Amino acid sequence: KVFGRCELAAAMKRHGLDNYRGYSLGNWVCAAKFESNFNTQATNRNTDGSTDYGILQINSRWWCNDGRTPGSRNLCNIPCSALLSSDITASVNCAKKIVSDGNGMNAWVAWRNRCKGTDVQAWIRGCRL
Ligand SMILES: [Cl-]
Ligand SMILES: [Cl-]
Ligand SMILES: [Cl-]
Ligand SMILES: [Cs+]
Ligand SMILES: [Cs+]
Ligand SMILES: [Cs+]
Ligand SMILES: [Cs+]
Ligand SMILES: [Cs+]
Ligand SMILES: [Cs+]
Ligand SMILES: [Cs+]
Ligand SMILES: [Cs+]
Ligand SMILES: [Cs+]
Ligand SMILES: [Cs+]
Ligand SMILES: [Cs+]
Ligand SMILES: [Cs+]
Ligand SMILES: [Cs+]
Ligand SMILES: [Cs+]
Ligand SMILES: [Cs+]
């Protein structure tokens, strides 16, 4: 599913992302935009052979199981396919773990390069919420 921005913001809010570990909802929406363009079915293979899945491009090296990533851990205890669901619960639950791992949202390189320090509130501007 391709979410609308206000639509996604609300679903993130519904699932407790808003200001989770101190990251305003704008941050999570901005990260989603640049990771997946709000597409739950997004996949992208990494140079190291792992693959990133879903709205927030969660990687199969550490977080989810895909069966083809040697050395990986499945720390979210989830098949990577569950991260492509139209329901964002699994992605959200797994992102809470990631953002708690010690480096905050810097875990998402695109966040650091494209959202960090910017006017992230624009991403939720006008949204009912
Ligand atoms: Cl947009
Ligand atoms: Cl294996
Ligand atoms: Cl932090
Ligand atoms: Cs919260
Ligand atoms: Cs909040
Ligand atoms: Cs790409
Ligand atoms: Cs790629
Ligand atoms: Cs990637
Ligand atoms: Cs990547
Ligand atoms: Cs990515
Ligand atoms: Cs495995
Ligand atoms: Cs593994
Ligand atoms: Cs595990
Ligand atoms: Cs789980
Ligand atoms: Cs850690
Ligand atoms: Cs870490
Ligand atoms: Cs990373
Ligand atoms: Cs800035």
UniProtKB/Swiss-Prot annotation:
Give the source's domain of life in one word. Eukaryota
Q: Show the InterPro entries listed in the entry.
A: Glyco_hydro_22, Glyco_hydro_22_CS, Glyco_hydro_22_lys, Lysozyme-like_dom_sf
**What is any Pfam family matched here?**
Lys
Q: Which PROSITE patterns match?
A: GLYCOSYL_HYDROL_F22_1, GLYCOSYL_HYDROL_F22_2
Q: Which GO terms describe its molecular function?
A: beta-N-acetylglucosaminidase activity; identical protein binding; lysozyme activity
Compartments where located: Secreted
Q: Which residues form the C-type lysozyme domain?
A: 1-129
The record's section on Gene3D superfamilies has: 1.10.530.10
| The family this protein is said to belong to | Belongs to the glycosyl hydrolase 22 family.
Q: What is this protein called?
A: Lysozyme C
Task: Provide the species name.
Answer: Gallus gallus
